[PDB]
């Protein structure tokens, strides 16, 4: 009937993007200063990693129940849940400030993991609900950006806030000030989400949302009887999991090939995540202008395969600035792909909920990342870095062709 | 399992890894050396013996904590 956009769309996208930033900061805070937390708690680097690995393990199971609550309860309920869990995870980490309270920090990080299942695949649902045509792909990218910027900030804030002193009493004071900051921002973002996050604007922002409005396992059966979405799940998994396996093993590579350059390995990782924030935005700003979702997806994908090859065959040319350029180009393209993939999924399966589509894409990427990381660490230890790198190139080359058999079946476009 | 390693020690020098993972050759090891697993039975083979092959060869199990050498 009437399709009107409101200005609260920005407010909602910014509040979501900000507590997604906060959640992504909580995921990486322990790692940024891992050696400091190993000493504070007296645990292994394995135990401190479990903190970062728990975010990824929780998502695969809790996706299906969380996406049901999405349609059974709504998007305000999902926002309040996610924000509240992000706040609870953060505050439980203030009964962990004693060397012997590692179980409680893990209790906190699990809660913070469960909060992500209510945040990671939600960008495309919020875009669909609040943003109209020619801006839906950009909200989704403003959220992916909120997440990437929290991973970045998180690399940079803990080494500044907490020094590498060994004193068990002053390090606790230096971790209190980080835990307090994050708790007090997760509380602020929570209280706003309860204030300003409407379940739906007054009018549908788009003609596709207006018509969407007019069994859970049946709908999961129907997304997997759709070949263009199966191909996209597989190829998104290949690309994003290769990105994960690339990032996990990036430090190890630069120390093997540039021994003594630990400062610059972390700098190269910041370059990957910063270049990625920019590509996330521009990919979305390019899609809401052109609407070229099968051709963008293929060219990017093919640019993630050219980039993995150049990285592969330039890691031992003895030039650290070349590694900066190559790793920055990958992160650029491999993070610009993620918002593009979500929106191409929403185009291939339009009436179907954006939650289920984006969550299935995320579960794939998290499965393929775990598999590729396990496989690569076994290939590198036994055959070298170039072989483990080629491994990633051959799954990217295989994914390129799979991306090309996905049809440009743009339903949300056809519904305008 | 396949947690068997074959080392070569020449007198007054450290053991050198020839084969690991039962059959996997370590990088740099002459290709004459090759190892096979057959249940709890493990066999090292030098396809062509060489002036170098004269030494002591030790089998090792790394399956359990108390690493045990042959």
């Amino acid at each position: 009937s009437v399709i009107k956009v409101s200005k609260r769309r920005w407010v909602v996208v910014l509040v979501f993007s900000c507590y997604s930033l906060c959640n992504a900061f909580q995921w990486i805070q322990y790692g940024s200063i891992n050696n400091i937390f190993m000493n504070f708690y007296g645990v292994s680097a394995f135990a401190i990693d479990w903190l970062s690995m728990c975010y990824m393990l929780t998502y695969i199971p809790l996706l299906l129940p969380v996406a049901w609550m999405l349609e059974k309860f709504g998007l305000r309920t999902i926002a309040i849940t996610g924000s509240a869990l992000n706040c609870l995870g953060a505050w439980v980490k203030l009964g962990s400030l004693e060397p012997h309270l590692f179980p409680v920090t893990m209790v906190g990080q699990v809660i913070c993991s469960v909060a992500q299942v209510f945040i990671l695949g939600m960008p495309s649902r919020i875009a669909s609900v609040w943003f109209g045509a020619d801006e839906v792909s950009t909200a989704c990218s403003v959220a992916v950006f909120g997440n990437q910027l929290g991973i970045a900030i998180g690399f940079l804030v803990p080494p500044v806030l907490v020094p590498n002193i060994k004193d068990p009493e002053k390090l606790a004071y230096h971790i209190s000030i980080m835990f307090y900051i994050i708790g007090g921002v997760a509380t602020f973002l929570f209280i706003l989400v309860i204030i300003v996050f409407k379940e739906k604007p007054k009018h549908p922002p788009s003609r596709a949302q207006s018509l969407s409005y007019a069994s859970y396992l049946s709908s999961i059966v129907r997304l997997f009887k759709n070949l263009n979405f199966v191909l996209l799940v597989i190829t998104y998994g290949l690309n994003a999991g290769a990105f994960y396996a690339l990032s996990t093993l990036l430090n190890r590579m630069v120390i093997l090939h540039f021994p003594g350059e630990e400062v610059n390995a972390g700098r190269i990782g910041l370059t990957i995540v910063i270049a990625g924030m920019f590509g996330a935005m521009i990919s979305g700003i390019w899609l809401d202008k052109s609407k070229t979702y099968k051709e963008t997806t293929l060219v990017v994908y093919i640019m993630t395969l050219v980039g993995m090859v150049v990285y592969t065959f330039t890691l031992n040319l003895n030039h650290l600035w070349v590694v900066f350029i190559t790793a920055g180009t990958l992160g650029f393209f491999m993070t610009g792909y993620l918002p593009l993939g979500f929106e191409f999924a929403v185009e291939l399966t339009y009436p179907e909920s954006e939650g289920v589509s984006s969550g299935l894409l995320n579960v794939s990427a998290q499965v393929f990342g775990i598999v590729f990381t396990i496989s690569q660490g076994q290939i590198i230890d036994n055959h070298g870095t170039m072989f483990g790198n080629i491994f990633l190139c051959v799954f990217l080359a295989l994914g390129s062709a799979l991306t090309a058999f996905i049809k440009s079946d743009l339903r949300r476009q056809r519904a305008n | 399992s396949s947690a068997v390693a074959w080392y070569q020690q020449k007198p007054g020098k450290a053991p050198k890894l020839l084969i690991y993972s039962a059959s996997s050759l370590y990088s740099g090891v002459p290709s004459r050396f090759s190892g096979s697993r057959s249940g709890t039975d493990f066999t090292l083979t030098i396809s062509s013996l060489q002036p170098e092959d004269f030494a002591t060869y030790y089998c090792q199990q790394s399956y359990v904590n108390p690493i045990t050498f042959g």
């Epitope: 645990v43 292994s44 394995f46 396990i374 660490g377 | 390693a5 090792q60």
Partner: nanobody, 129 residues
Framework: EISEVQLVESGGGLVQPGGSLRLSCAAS????????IHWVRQAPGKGLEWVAS????????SYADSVKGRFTISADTSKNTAYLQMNSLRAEDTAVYYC??????????????????????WGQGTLVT
Amino acid sequence: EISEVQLVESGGGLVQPGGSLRLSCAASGFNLSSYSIHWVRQAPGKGLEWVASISSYYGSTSYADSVKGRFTISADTSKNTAYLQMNSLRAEDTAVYYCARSSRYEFFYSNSWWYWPAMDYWGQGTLVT
């Protein structure tokens, strides 16, 4: 470039029975933080014998039964040096103590699922009498 990996054992010397000595193993080319270090001993009239292993990553220390309660394995990742404290040495602890490295790089996804690691690089040895 890929610096070559070297393990250098120091400390070994004659010591009186009930003597305590501390061997060291400097590590170049890799970090004791990503790899587990093992101690193996050979007596002039014996063969290779596994003493102790430490994982910095997994925070695990394992000891041979004979050495247990007299030998402590430890690692200083800040120096890339591992050590062995032999508190109550017996005349049958006279041997060439060699420090070796496992092939497996330790990280969260590290596993023995296709390839079981082995002792890749070894030191020259330091003799304790």
